[PDB]
Amino acid sequence: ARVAVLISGTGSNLQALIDSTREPNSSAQIDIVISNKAAVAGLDKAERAGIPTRVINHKLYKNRVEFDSAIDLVLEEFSIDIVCLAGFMRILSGPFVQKWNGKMLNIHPSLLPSFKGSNAHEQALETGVTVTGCTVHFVAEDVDAGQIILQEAVPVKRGDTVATLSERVKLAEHKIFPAALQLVASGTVQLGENGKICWV
């Protein structure tokens, strides 16, 4: 299966996916990396790995649908089968999500359904949980509400900050995102016709 990875920043999740998809038994190949932001470290990581990159600046588009259309054009250019959102921070439009239904995965740094949104660690710390984690899910129109593929729990230590908690949770993200991508790319896991996860 042919994979696009969408990023907005550092790209540690991208790097873990590069490493995993290059293992001999990988059912996935990363063929394009798309950032909505110029000059982020994730682009350097892609270039170092010899993977093509595109920058599609959302600020240059009148609305989400036009921006998503520009992304979709590149996905078609590279005959992409599966999209991974890896630190990509834009909400995607309904029609784009529908087109890619069952083919698009996101990593989120909480145990969904807790702490949806862009500041999950801030929320986890404010709430005072002692266990947080990360989630890979299929992307549905409602943000962070699509079907869960894998999760991993991560402890919150007393005195944690976003810096220390995010660091600990990223170690888990780097395990479950490659594992989830392999499950979907191999056809082991799919989004069922009933909209529920199906393990074949």
Ligand SMILES: Nc1nc2[nH]c(CCCc3cc(C(=O)N[C@@H](CCC(=O)O)C(=O)O)cs3)cc2c(=O)[nH]1
């Ligand atoms: N339809 C849909 N889109 C998705 N995009 C992402 C991946 C991103 C999930 C998130 C983005 C934001 C958000 O508020 N984005 C802002 C910009 C934030 C920023 O400037 O950094 C926006 O898009 O206007 C909060 S969580 C997941 C996901 C999903 O499940 N469904």
Ligand SMILES: NCC(=O)N[C@@H]1O[C@H](COP(=O)([O-])[O-])[C@@H](O)[C@H]1O
């Ligand atoms: N709303 C999605 C979200 O918060 N994504 C989170 O952004 C970070 C990106 O790190 P990376 O650029 O090093 O992969 C990761 O923690 C990812 O789960």
